[PDB]
């Protein structure tokens, strides 16, 4: 019905933005304790106002391709979704020489996605539907 | 003998990550192998140490995660070899992380830098013969 404290309502959905970071599988595990989930972005609108809050800098979203193709954690369907790319991305990179290519997905300082190396620390956002 | 594909130096055996790992991870995987995240203690070790690595971003076994500077196994920091870079450490909290940087790594140059321990990063294990 309402949004816990400390969240922030928008479009009938709650999120919550860290001011911290974590892996994406800690932030991941972090959203399902608050019976949350890891932001699914859908629509342009929802893209601009995460966008706002955030700001420019490098936050994990709930899309990944651990186990294949790309996945949003809620199974909302990639193919037929939103998508906003940044331009060259996704690209499964291996060259950080961190071992294995990219497969988490993460707002870039203009709120165009990356993948990126999961164990990265970076920010994150949780999101509850009402 | 130092175990297989580790590299022997003046009575030490080192293995070289070729993946990153967030520092407790690293110390973690070189404990099992009942080693230690390398620790750096004459030029001529850092000297070794930086041409296996080349120019990446590497943890060592030096960290302030509770309150001074320590190395893993117990070696004296303040009276020790130090080759951190120039402005560090610093124990930044600029990024935006949590916390400042409790862990040293070695750098592009081969000099110290201290980061935020999450960050996943190549390492060395050590091993005295
Ligand atoms: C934070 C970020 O955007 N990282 C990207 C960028 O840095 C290297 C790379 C390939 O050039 O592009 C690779 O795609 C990374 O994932
Ligand atoms: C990899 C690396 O050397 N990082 C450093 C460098 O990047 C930001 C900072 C302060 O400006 O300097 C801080 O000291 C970081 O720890
Ligand atoms: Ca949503
Ligand atoms: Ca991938
Ligand atoms: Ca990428
Ligand atoms: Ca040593
Ligand atoms: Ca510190
Ligand atoms: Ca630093
Ligand atoms: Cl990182």
């Known amino acids: 019905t ?5 969240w922030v309502e ?20 972090y959203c399902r304790l608050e019976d ?11 893209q601009k106002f995460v966008q706002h809050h955030i700001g420019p800098v490098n936050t994990w979203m709930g899309l990944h391709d651990q186990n294949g193709p790309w996945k949003w954690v809620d199974g909302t369907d990639y193919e037929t979704g939103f998508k906003n790319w ?10 950080h020489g961190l071992g294995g ?12 996605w990356n993948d990126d190396v999961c164990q ?11």
């Open 10 to 29: 928008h479009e009938r959905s709650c999120y919550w933005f860290s001011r911290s970071g974590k892996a994406w599988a800690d932030a991941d595990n």
């Open 86 to 95: 940044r331009p060259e991305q996704p690209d499964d990179w291996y060259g």
């Open 120 to 130: 990265r620390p970076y920010r994150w956002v949780c999101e509850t539907e009402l």
């Open 101 to 112: 290519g990219e497969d988490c997905a993460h707002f870039t300082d203009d709120g165009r």
């Open 36 to 46: 949350a989930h890891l932001v699914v972005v859908t629509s342009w609108e929802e």
């Open 2 to 6: 309402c949004c816990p404290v400390n």
